[PDB]
Design a protein around this nucleic acid. Structure first.
Ligand code: ZN
Length: 854
DNA sequence: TCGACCGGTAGATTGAGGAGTATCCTGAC
DNA sequence: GTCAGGATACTCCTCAATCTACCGGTCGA
């Protein structure tokens, strides 16, 4: 890595460089700019004087750039002044400016340290060191000091927005083109100034703006793309290229390869969008044909930053990680569907036989480590630090794998290694608490913040270490901890909250957002809309509480005046994870469900008042006509199966079982719903058929549904032609006919008990546990098979019957004598457990038993 | 001590998808 | 010397599903 033009000087200067502390690798890295090789070797002892505590890595980084020697010579005679009154610069910021900005940027910051920080601009030192530390920062600084008043006054741009526009490589061009294109992009094409500033704050913002001005009246009026999609495509490095290829590769990818336009937009709205689109066009048939992938898998691989490399690497390495290392294609696609998936996938190929053998891991654990945006670094750090953490700190290997299976991964793991002997000895924590803080996205920041703030929040604010650890043990606990330290004196002393409520609000995902929103909205929601602080805190004490609380502000009068809901019902809908979605969906769907589908507002509120109440409501809208017309389920049963947490998957599974499952699965699913009568006869005699039809008629009239004589004749024919057929009468009236289930009870599955009740004529009735009588819910044997048989005997005129069940644990203890309460006078009920019944507890009965009445 | 083949409510924990922030390297002129 | 495009790593916020823990009325032991 040494050029022939450089060797004749590196050989001469190696003798001088060695002895100051420079290794040969540092010499090779620094030899990119030959002029530095002398300048360091003659002045090193001086520079460490001008820049105390600047390691050799920093010196190499500064001196190896395009103007490293000049940058170091400038920092030699400029670092004295920038550490003075105007800017409070230290060594780190000086090296940050000189490494990236260069000698020109250092000189510019030196000469203009007064005007930039002075009154007319009011730039903080951080903003100056962020504008200056970029490739060509002197031009950006001059352009800012020339154009800040104009943008901040004439165009209404915040100084933070202008600094974010200038804090990029093409900062000068971006500023000088925003200043001339804001009147046009925000008046003719209808973009908000925030959209233009989001477009322009990128490495090529001038090109992106200049090409959006042309491709808004083309990619919208012809290709059918919304302005939000265009301004999300263009808001990335080199967005001009992404737009120019979406202009020509949208007809092809949406016609030949059959990609949805939203899929193409999702592919293109990334840093290297053009390259990803071109390589998808090249590699879609090959990957979907030879390597067995589906188009959705390829789109999910390519919808990521630098997805061309990930896609090509999958093409190259899929026949190897599936044939030699044993990973399945789903796992390879999961590894590669991330940022820098090429590196993760190559590192898995390299290290999977090493981590899984020398360190005791398993392929699933390695794949779970690698399936993140920094999987290569996490895997390498795990291989480095498993011998160290697991014995010098006690962390069990699953704890290390849980720490590293996150987006940070390497950072959190190194920080844990550095900070376990501190937090566990001085601040009084335990390793479990540290591993709980660190097992999140950005746990290095959380750990450092806890170390810095635990002595403060525990004395000045009155909290406790458990509360601080609960606040910190989330994604972005640094922000929640800082905002708690900032706002607890205000929230707990002005609005009337208490530290318990503030800690409950903060102990969530976006706790900083929810806490600031509560500060902003509590003097409003409890003054105009009529809520109370307890209701607002309950709305806010969830993930995304800012969204839910703002949505409540927006939709309390609309919901409470257009649809007749009470404030309590709106608050109950909102007091859940995802309450914004639930509230918006309730607004959208309350009339449709209430009128077209024959529901009530209370049923819609009950469906929506659950975690995932938007999915559970759209699913009900989609599936109610199918279930209540073909399968005979009443709307009440659908409402009660959807009014549960996670009630979309349950309803979908019920539909799948009813549509294509085996007959026994349909039978059990239909019994597990409600008041259905599952009758079966023994022979074809007239008396038995009449008894079965009589029982069916009584059950039907118990539910208030009248059976037509045609249905009676059909049932009679079915019973008179099919021996062993099962008639299952659902509450709505539909009579399912199962021709062949079994003649024996199903195997016990540990959850639902089955049972068959036999009368004196051979008629058999089916029962399962659960769904007890609502008027006997106080009893401890409500929903047990024996109680169900007792109540069935009580309702009709049956005085001698035998119920067989299949629970291997035997008869309950509660049914020991409370079952005799439900039988009428003189009634005889014989419970029979299975052959292998054993008493699993102190009171179970596992033998044939007889109960009488009272 | 003696019992749920129950259900309802509250907090907790696991997983996924989206968006924003930050740094470094290559090529062109 | 500045500018444009591409790849990789880390931190923060929102939504959905599942899991776990606790508790009650009423009857012989
Ligand atoms: Zn029982």
């Amino acid at each position: 890595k040494i050029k022939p033009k450089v060797r004749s000087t590196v050989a001469q200067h190696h003798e001088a460089l060695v002895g100051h502390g420079f290794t040969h690798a540092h010499i090779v890295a620094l030899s990119q700019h030959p002029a530095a090789l002398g300048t360091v070797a003659v002045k090193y002892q001086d520079m460490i004087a001008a820049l105390p505590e600047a390691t050799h890595e920093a010196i190499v980084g500064v001196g190896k750039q395009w103007s490293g020697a000049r940058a170091l010579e400038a920092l030699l005679t400029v670092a004295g002044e920038l550490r003075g009154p105007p800017l409070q610069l230290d060594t780190g910021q000086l090296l940050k400016i000189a490494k990236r900005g260069g000698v020109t940027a250092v000189e510019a910051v030196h000469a203009w340290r007064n005007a930039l920080t002075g009154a007319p601009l009011n730039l903080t030192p951080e903003q100056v060191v962020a504008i200056a530390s970029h490739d060509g920062g002197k031009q950006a600084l001059e352009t800012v000091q020339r154009l800040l008043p104009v943008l901040c006054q004439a165009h209404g741009l915040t100084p933070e927005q202008v600094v974010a526009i200038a804090s990029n490589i093409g900062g000068k061009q971006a500023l000088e083109t925003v200043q001339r294109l804001l009147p046009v992009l925000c008046q003719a094409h209808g973009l908000t100034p925030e959209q233009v500033v989001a477009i322009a704050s990128n490495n090529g913002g001038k090109q992106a703006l200049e090409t959006v001005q042309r491709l808004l009246p083309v990619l919208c009026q012809a290709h059918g793309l919304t302005p939000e999609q265009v301004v999300a495509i263009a808001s990335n490095n080199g967005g001009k290229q992404a737009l120019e290829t979406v202009q020509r590769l949208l007809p092809v990818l949406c016609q030949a390869h059959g990609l949805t336009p939203e899929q193409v937009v999702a592919i293109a709205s990334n840093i290297g969008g053009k390259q990803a689109l071109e390589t998808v066009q090249r590699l879609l048939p090959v990957l979907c044909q030879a390597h067995g992938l589906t188009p959705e898998q390829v789109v999910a691989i390519a919808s990521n930053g630098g997805g061309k490399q990930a896609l090509e690497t999958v093409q190259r390495l899929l026949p190897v990680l599936c044939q030699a290392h044993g990973l399945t294609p789903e796992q390879v696609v999961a590894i590669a569907s991330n940022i820098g998936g090429k590196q993760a996938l190559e590192t898995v190929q390299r290290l999977l036989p090493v981590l899984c053998q020398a360190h005791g891991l398993t392929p699933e654990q390695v794949v779970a480590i690698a399936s993140h945006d920094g999987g290569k670094q996490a895997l390498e750090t795990v291989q480095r630090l498993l011998p160290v953490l697991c014995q010098a700190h006690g962390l069990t290997p699953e704890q290390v794998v849980a720490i590293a299976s996150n987006g940070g991964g390497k950072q959190a793991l190194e920080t844990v290694q550095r900070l376990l002997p501190v937090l566990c000895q001085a601040h009084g924590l335990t390793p479990e608490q540290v591993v709980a803080i660190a097992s999140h996205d950005g746990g290095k920041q959380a750990l450092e913040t806890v170390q810095r703030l635990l002595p403060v929040l525990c004395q000045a604010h009155g909290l406790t270490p458990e509360q601080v650890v609960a606040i910190a043990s989330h994604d972005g606990g640094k922000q929640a901890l800082e905002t708690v330290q900032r706002l607890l004196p205000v929230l707990c002393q002005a609005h009337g909250l208490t530290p318990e409520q503030v800690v409950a609000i903060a102990s969530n995902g976006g706790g900083k957002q929810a806490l600031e929103t509560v500060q902003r909205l509590l003097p409003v929601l409890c003054q105009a809309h009529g809520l109370t602080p307890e209701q607002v805190v309950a709305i806010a004490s969830h993930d995304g509480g800012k969204q839910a609380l703002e949505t409540v502000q927006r939709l309390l009068p609309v919901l409470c005046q257009a649809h007749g809901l009470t404030p309590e019902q709106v608050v109950a809908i909102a007091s859940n994870i995802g309450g914004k979605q639930a509230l918006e969906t309730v607004q959208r769907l309350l009339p449709v469900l209430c009128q077209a589908h024959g529901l009530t507002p209370e049923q819609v509120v009950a469906i929506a008042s659950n975690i995932g109440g938007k999915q559970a409501l759209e699913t009900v809208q989609r599936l109610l006509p199918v279930l209540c017309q073909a399968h005979g389920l009443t709307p009440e049963q659908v409402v009660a199966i959807a009014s549960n947490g996670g009630g979309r998957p349950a309803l979908e599974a019920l539909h799948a079982v009813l549509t294509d499952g085996p007959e026994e699965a349909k039978y059990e699913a239909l019994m597990r719903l409600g008041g259905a009568l599952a009758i079966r006869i023994s022979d074809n005699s007239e008396k038995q058929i009449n008894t079965a039809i009589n029982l069916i008629k009584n059950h039907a009239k118990s539910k208030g549904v009248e059976l037509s004589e045609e249905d009676i004749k059909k049932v009679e024919k079915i019973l008179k032609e099919n021996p062993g057929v099962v008639l299952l009468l659902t509450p709505s009236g539909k009579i399912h006919v199962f021709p062949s289930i079994s003649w024996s009870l199903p195997e016990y599955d540990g959850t639902t008990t089955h049972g068959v009740l036999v009368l004196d004529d051979g008629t058999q009735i089916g029962f399962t546990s659960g769904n007890g009588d609502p008027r006997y819910t106080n009893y401890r044997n409500n929903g047990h098979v024996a109680q169900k048989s007792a109540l069935y005997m009580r309702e009709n005129n049956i005085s001698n019957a035998t119920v067989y069940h299949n629970n291997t644990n035997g008869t309950c203890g509660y049914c020991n004598t409370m079952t005799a309460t439900f039988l009428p006078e003189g009634a005889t009920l014989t419970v029979v457990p299975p052959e292998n019944a054993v008493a699993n507890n102190s009171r179970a009965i596992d033998y044939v038993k007889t109960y009488t009445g009272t």
